[model samples]
Target: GMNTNLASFIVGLIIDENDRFYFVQKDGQTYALAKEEGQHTVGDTVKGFAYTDMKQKLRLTTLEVTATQDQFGWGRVTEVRKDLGVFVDTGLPDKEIVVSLDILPELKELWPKKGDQLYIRLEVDKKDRIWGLLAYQEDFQRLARPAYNNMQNQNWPAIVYRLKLSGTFVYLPENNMLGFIHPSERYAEPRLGQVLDARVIGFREVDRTLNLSLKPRSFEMLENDAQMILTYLESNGGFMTLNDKSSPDDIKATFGISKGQFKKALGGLMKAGKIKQDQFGTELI
Candidate 1:
């Protein structure tokens, strides 16, 4: 069996009726139209978007949804299922569409999480399963504005749109500009749709995009011990195998400091929310 009418707006005949719904039939497929959608009688023609409810029963709703089979629209990510992919609310009253794992980023850490938004369109497979298709590069290009050179060094509010081994693609909402953040320019990997205070480091002449950095220009004044710890963490991938609970001999050998002083610095950094320490080690946050 196939759901030719799923995820699309079509005209169908109201061939059956009941106390709670009107059955609309299109191409031999019957869809239940809620009575709340307005009055309809048998033999009348009705138009609506066809989709299945949570129970897998065919549903036809007259309300204008956020997205369609041919149109892309914004949807808020509600949750992520590593196996099934991400769930986004596409203006459906009781159903959320899934963006299949096949199309998501290869890196699981970069996958979109809850509260993120995605621009997507509907996809109805041969098996009658509905899905959400993420907007393509061209979709973003159509919405991007030309990036100017004068923006260098200026900090802008940016949102992560795509993540790859080479870099992260970002959207600067303040001016509708497109930006890129190379992996080396950030202290940590940014999550999809994460809002960041990214600074423009250079302009990409060929692509007309801005090269951005998630790192600050410089650190604020810190004690030598604290500064050294931070620098070590930065060079060691934002983490180190040093913690307050480490042996004094290990602390002295690593940082040439007494255990008491190491613990002092660790406490100070923790109080400032600059780093966190666990049984395993200290991690830059």
Candidate 2:
């Protein structure tokens, strides 16, 4: 058959002891080809085309690379060894890479099966063999990091996931981030999963993930005791003072928040045009 770029031909072959299928081209040169581990059958007529590379060597361009291993960035995984350690098919003609089971955890709950895909990193052990891992903290950190450039401030409409008396938890689908809207700052009652437009009040570092909030309060509420006080105040209304006599201690005892937080919340209410400060007490406008 003419070895044209677009041309194809069929040739029947046998699997030798080495699991290789050998064939001779029209030029009478022998070439050994191995089927993709999970895909070929012995004595089957395989059809393919041929091409010569820049090196002027005739090669079969249509054949799949039978190495079961592939590398991406800093990691590589392979399937080559039949038992014991997993063998990575590292595209080498002579050796299959082996990664021992000691590197993987027992809690991982699974063994590497034939043709199974695994995420792995190339580690040079004392013996100089590449190893694979079922889990890698560095890999997790890489995934947790921002995957793309140009992450500008994103303002998205999200649905309330939960509405505690203290705050409303909203889910941000853009970055899989969650946000909270304090009840004191919420002008209206929000139902669970109810969609709302939320401003990214900022982020909170929780372990490795970020917890977001929508409350427009000062930094004092971020503290543990102040946060508890704010939670308590949202659950209970303060007493009515005739001459705005609700003192700091009075408001704290009645609403459970510090005087500063109560005043800040009232300020926010006034700014939002929801309430007005009166000579007696703050009234909802």
Candidate 3:
């Protein structure tokens, strides 16, 4: 019955003391309150939240706990154990709350990684263990602002809240806008809680959710070789004397690339209309 108080606030009598903490007793349970919290003495009533410390011993603290029995708050994941669950720091220096694997993503790969943010509330199980309970989808929608038009083409920073085979769901905490990125709109899948620079594409009429794209524009995807060639032309008076007809040995010595690679890069620039092969050589247009 003592464990029933885990994660719930308590005002108990200071029954004992030691160098590090004062023992606060309530409901036949004694909890340790760090001496640094505030000045208190035996027989005095102190208010604190009852929870287990890093060592699994009962502890009481007067500090403002980030997540508690009835309130949801965000916390940064400290570490993860596949066999156990993800541990998050919920503003407690001596405690890391566990988000049990029972409610986590089925695929371990989709699980939130270290340093990811999770919005959760504390839950005390029948066995007296306190766990971090993930917030539901409705919780996000309740907190989200209605997305409107004219958001297209604008870049917004969002954190991945959920991942699915169909797409990634993100919530823009800054603006409280909920967005979705379809699988086709991203080059690769986003991990849960990953922060992404999402581009607004459109809005889904059904839910008023903004549709996002995680892929960069075509010019932004230029290969390293192409970028180097562009850099060389810019530095060389807007022209480079190396063309597709140049010798492989010369290409290797000058650009540090093979003849085939040099020509491929040149061909790309030519197609993009950024450069032309004239009698002078490859020249930036």
Candidate 4:
């Protein structure tokens, strides 16, 4: 009688005492063993090999078992057990691996079916079974966001996604990100789909997203802002009249700068002999 180990790669064969068997392995290894006296030669070809007890042999390569470790890998969806999880085929002996529901929180409404391809990380447990996660991309984006400093002060190329009377929506192709500009932020209307050089303004609090502006300015831009305001007031006959009755909202709406900034510009104009100031407002001299 032959005793066989149900474990993987188990090998043993039953043979009669006088019988000899030649064992040929797929790897081209061959071993010849003769049965002891009174041993029955059942001659089970499937059970011929004697199992070797090698702990090192049982360990699989990291590359070979990536799917089992929940590391980065690709697999095809084979089955969807909604009550349990989705199964993915990763070309292992198990034929299928499970992606638990908790890891796939976004799949609440729709479940993946057979033939669906997915990129995932193979996570293994103490039992050495594999699982996957569909939220890996979102997690990766989050991890990378901090590294970008919200793209602040970084000069890069951008594309205008859309044009509006107020401003333009620009896409940051490098980051797959989007941002906008108000009409007051720009000197002219940016054309849609036009590629332009841009720089990061900062993160937008409104949407908790990145904010970018097309004009790349240094400290020199402040000087330019002052000069532009001064020129506009000078060309319009030196001083413009506005009282405390003037709407602060209207003033801010017309000029992107703050009231303090407007006053500063007015002072600069006055010093330049370009305007005269009165109680109500300044007038062009």
Best by TM-score: 3
TM-score of 3: 0.70
Off by over 4 Å in 3: 148-151, 218-285
Q: Could you estimate the TM-score for every candidate? A: 0.63, 0.24, 0.70, 0.28
Ranking by lDDT: 1, 3, 4, 2
Q: In candidate 3, what are the lDDT values of residues 1-285, reduced to their tens digit?
A: 436788988899999999999999999889999999889989999998889887878999999877998888788898999999899888865989999999888888788899888888998888788799988778889889889876766788898887788899899877788999999999767877677888988889889899999887446445679889989987987887888898999899999999989988888787776678866688775
Colliding residue pairs in candidate 1: none
Candidate 1 vs candidate 2: the TM-score winner is 1
* Model 1 residue 205 distance off true place after TM-score fit, in angstroms: 3.6
Which runs of model 2 end up more than 4 angstroms from their true locations?
Answer: 1-83, 90-95, 107-109, 125-128, 133-135, 146-285
Residue-level lDDT of model 2, residues 1-285, one tens digit each, is 433221123352433324443442444443344344335454554444333332434334234432222332211334434345666543333334456766532333233444433444344344323344333434334434432322223356655544456766555556545556676556766643245666654455453233334445343224444344334444445313511345777877766666777666665554544444567665432
With candidate 1 superimposed using the best TM-score fit, by how many Å does residue 204's alpha carbon deviate from the native?
A: 3.4
Which consecutive 10 residues in model 3 have the weakest lDDT in total?
215-224
Q: What TM-score does structure 1 among the candidates reach? A: 0.63
What ranges in model 1 sit over 4 Å off? Answer: 14-23, 34-44, 148-157, 173-175, 197-203, 216-285
